[PDB]
Design a protein around this nucleic acid. Structure first.
Lengths: 29, 220, 144, 83, 173, 92
RNA sequence: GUGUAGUAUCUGUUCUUUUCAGUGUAACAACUGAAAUGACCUCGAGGCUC
RNA sequence: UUACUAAGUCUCAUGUACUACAU
């Protein structure tokens, strides 16, 4: 018997835009 | 004392409950009965297994004496080690064979019984009889009679059951309106073997997940 | 939303993205029977279902249950699901969702198997990959 | 001995994780833990916090967050009543 | 709903009963006892259908039909006023009692004559608490067949309580 | 411990330090005493380190350990990894 | 093929002060305290009994 | 046509396993 078992592939096309945190440092040169 | 005698009646508690039949006499001494009725009677909660209040340590069962030791899942029983090693009162096997039994043969395989959301196993219960039951509701259908029960019934081949005559006067089964039986609503020449009739249905995908191919991992 | 007749998409206030499916025991009954006989009339239910009705009337009141089919957690709160028969002409129909905190993502049903077998193995790799680096970095410290 | 250790670990886990129902716990004590954890997660996830902000319609989101924080203590109901 | 079945050979098994009656109607449940004193079957079963329509149908078509192990299979479908009366005359027949209490109320059963102490007493079953109150009112401490009889409620302590009028009213309804 | 009952643990907020176990106890997940697929190195609070007692085996509390103790992958998922400072204060 | 200490588990057996009150119990159980003596009526029950 | 439940406690005996300990 065919197993239904839906196999879903999750992708984040556009990434979460509500910016909850920030920092002022100088990281890379 | 006063708190023990302060308790409301269980029927007074039933009215607060949307599903009153779950509440029981011992819920009267629930320290928070109005709350416990709401939780216990909430939609998807599964009531505590009732083997509590018994001192038998949950298994004294007489039925436990008569339980079978074990039975191999038939797919594993195909592997033939049953004959190679006698467990009841060396056998060289192939890696491809065993691996394929679990994967190639047994990928789609699943135990037949399992259990459901709220299934809880009480002491006296035995699943096996219910497994043969569910499987039997599957195989056996009206209009067909096995040769064993046919021999016990003493009904020879080609002859209709005795309830076909009383079914001629009384009429078809109220439960099976679509049932057909040879000689009456159904062609007697199609009478064959153990089947004297069959239900004729009057009713006459991919589920978004259709795999359209099945490929198991290969050992080699 | 609906992917199908027998399956449903849903999100949570708390960010779970799940999909449920009606059991084949129910699909056989509704495929083989008319709805008018459900409320009143004769519909023959296996012995277990009724025993679950008198045994557990609160949960089994609706006499069937959704077996969990897919479950997932996206930390956003999904606003809108849409099931697209094709995404830019692609064969596999996808379902794309926009979250409240904002996001758009998709669940692609994988055809065949070794698709999800290879994908599953790659995800298994990347899952503990940090631990594999830590055990290699540990062994090299044992040698040094 | 073993159960006796389970008592000490009951004291430690109760200390760290706050409310853990031991044997007898009043509905007032336990429901308070329920409310505190639910509010805790509503304000804890920036997601659900953003959600409650809009559905409630407050002018700013931190009003909803600090609202939940205040809503954790019981007297905050009477506090709103006194406004 | 549920039907009794009897005259069953212990060699008849559960699957055989199921396969038998599914031919008649759909079978919801089968209780087919298994003796804990003989470790087998005691030869009668109970088949619970999905309704009394299929139940009664199977009662009509199934009764005296199927022959299993040469033995025939059988199928069968599966609170009143009481007055104690003391010091009755020896010449008082039960039918005479029936005649005496019919005028007051309809009798659900026949009187019961018994002897206490020598002392002839009887229990009289009325269908109505109020008609029982009539036979009490008229017949209490009365002389019949030149003998003084006493009419009151029989013990259960005695009938005629407040809840008794309430529920007996309902059983009348 | 999982097996010996009277053994008492520490359960404080772990510090940066890593607990040591002796070669005799080597390979045990300090909670479940499992030998399989260890994951993260144990971390103990500073109160369990200080002087000589830091060198002791966090498991058997007696011998001086060279090796670091790791939690298994079953305890790392059960979260007992992060529960607190594992140590055995009483010898048992 | 033995002895010292000790344990568990069957089975057999049997029903401990009639009551009251408290603890206790999910309710039991169990535990803790005391004690009626006399008279009468109907079929071991019963008493707005004295 | 029989619509599916019994042992418990005590006492004094029998049945059978077992655990430290010594030749």
């Amino acid at each position: 018997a065919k197993d239904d078992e839906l196999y879903l592939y999750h992708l984040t096309l556009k990434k979460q835009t509500n910016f909850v945190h920030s920092c002022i440092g100088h990281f890379v040169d | 004392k006063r708190r023990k005698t302060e308790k409301p009646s269980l029927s007074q508690l039933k009215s607060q409950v949307p599903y009153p039949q779950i509440i029981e006499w011992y819920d009267c001494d629930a320290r928070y009965p109005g709350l416990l009725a709401s939780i216990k009677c909430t939609k998807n909660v599964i009531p505590v297994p009732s083997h509590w209040q018994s001192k038998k340590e949950y298994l004294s069962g007489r039925s436990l004496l008569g339980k079978r030791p074990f039975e191999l899942p038939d797919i594993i029983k195909k592997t033939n080690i049953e004959q190679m090693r006698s467990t009841l009162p060396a056998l060289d096997l192939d890696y491809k064979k065993l691996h394929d039994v679990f994967f190639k043969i047994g990928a789609n395989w699943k135990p037949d019984h399992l259990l459901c959301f709220g299934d809880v196993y009480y002491e006296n219960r035995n699943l096996f009889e219910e497994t043969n039951w569910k499987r039997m509701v599957d195989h056996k259908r009206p209009g067909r009679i096995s040769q064993e029960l046919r021999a016990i019934m003493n009904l020879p081949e080609g002859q209709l059951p005795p309830w076909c005559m009383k079914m001629k006067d009384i009429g078809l089964p109220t439960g099976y309106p679509d049932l057909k039986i040879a000689g009456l609503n159904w062609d007697i020449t199609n009478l064959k073997g153990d089947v004297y009739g069959k239900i004729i249905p009057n009713h006459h995908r991919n589920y978004f997940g259709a795999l359209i191919s099945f490929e198991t991992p290969e050992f080699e | 939303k609906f992917l199908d007749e027998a399956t449903v998409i849903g999100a949570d206030r708390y960010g779970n993205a799940w999909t449920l499916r009606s059991p084949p025991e129910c699909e056989k009954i509704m495929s083989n029977h008319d709805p008018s006989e459900l409320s009143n009339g004769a519909i023959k239910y296996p012995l277990d279902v009724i025993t679950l009705q008198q045994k557990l009337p609160n949960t089994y009141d609706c006499k069937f249950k959704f077996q969990l089919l897919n479950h997932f957690f996206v930390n956003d709160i999904i606003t809108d699901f849409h099931i697209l028969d094709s995404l830019s002409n692609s064969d596999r129909p996808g379902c794309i969702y926009m979250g409240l905190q904002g996001t758009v993502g998709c669940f692609i049903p994988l055809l065949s198997k070794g698709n999800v077998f290879m994908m599953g193995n790659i995800e298994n790799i990347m899952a503990e990959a940090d631990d594999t680096f830590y055990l290699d970095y540990e062994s090299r410290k044992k040698n040094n | 001995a073993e159960k006796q250790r389970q008592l000490k670990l009951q004291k430690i886990y109760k200390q760290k994780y706050i409310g853990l129902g031991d044997e007898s716990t009043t509905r007032e004590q336990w429901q308070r833990n329920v409310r505190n954890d639910t509010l805790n997660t509503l304000q804890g996830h920036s997601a659900s916090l953003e959600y409650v902000s809009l559905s409630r319609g407050d002018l700013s989101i931190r009003d909803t967050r600090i609202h939940l924080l205040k809503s954790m203590s019981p007297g905050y109901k009477a506090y709103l009543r006194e406004e | 709903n549920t039907v009794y079945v009897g005259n069953i050979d212990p060699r008849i098994t559960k699957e055989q009963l199921y396969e038998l009656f599914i031919q008649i109607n759909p079978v919801l449940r089968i209780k087919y006892p298994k003796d804990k004193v003989l470790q087998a079957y005691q030869g009668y079963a109970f088949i619970e259908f999905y309704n009394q329509g299929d139940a009664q149908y199977a009662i009509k078509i199934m009764n005296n039909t199927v022959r299993l192990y040469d033995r025939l299979i059988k199928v069968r479908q599966v609170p009143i006023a009481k007055l104690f009366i003391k010091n009755l005359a020896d010449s008082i027949d039960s039918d005479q009692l029936v005649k005496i209490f019919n005028k007051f109320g309809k009798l659900i059963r026949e009187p019961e004559i018994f002897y206490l102490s020598k002392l002839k007493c009887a229990y009289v079953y009325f269908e109505d608490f109020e008609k029982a109150d009539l036979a009490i009112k008229s017949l209490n401490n009365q002389l019949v067949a030149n003998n003084r009889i006493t009419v009151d409620y029989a013990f259960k302590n005695g009938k005629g309580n407040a809840k008794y009028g309430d529920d007996v009213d309902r059983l009348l309804n | 411990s999982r097996h010996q009952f009277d053994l008492i643990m520490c359960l404080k907020q772990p510090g940066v330090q890593t607990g040591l176990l002796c070669e005799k106890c080597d390979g045990k997940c300090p909670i479940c005493d499992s030998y399989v697929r260890p994951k993260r190195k144990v971390r103990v609070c500073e109160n369990c380190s200080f002087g000589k007692q830091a060198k002791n085996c966090i498991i058997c509390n007696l011998n001086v350990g060279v090796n670091d103790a790791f939690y298994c992958w079953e305890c790392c998922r059960l979260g007992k990894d992060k529960d607190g400072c594992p140590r055995i204060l009483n010898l048992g």
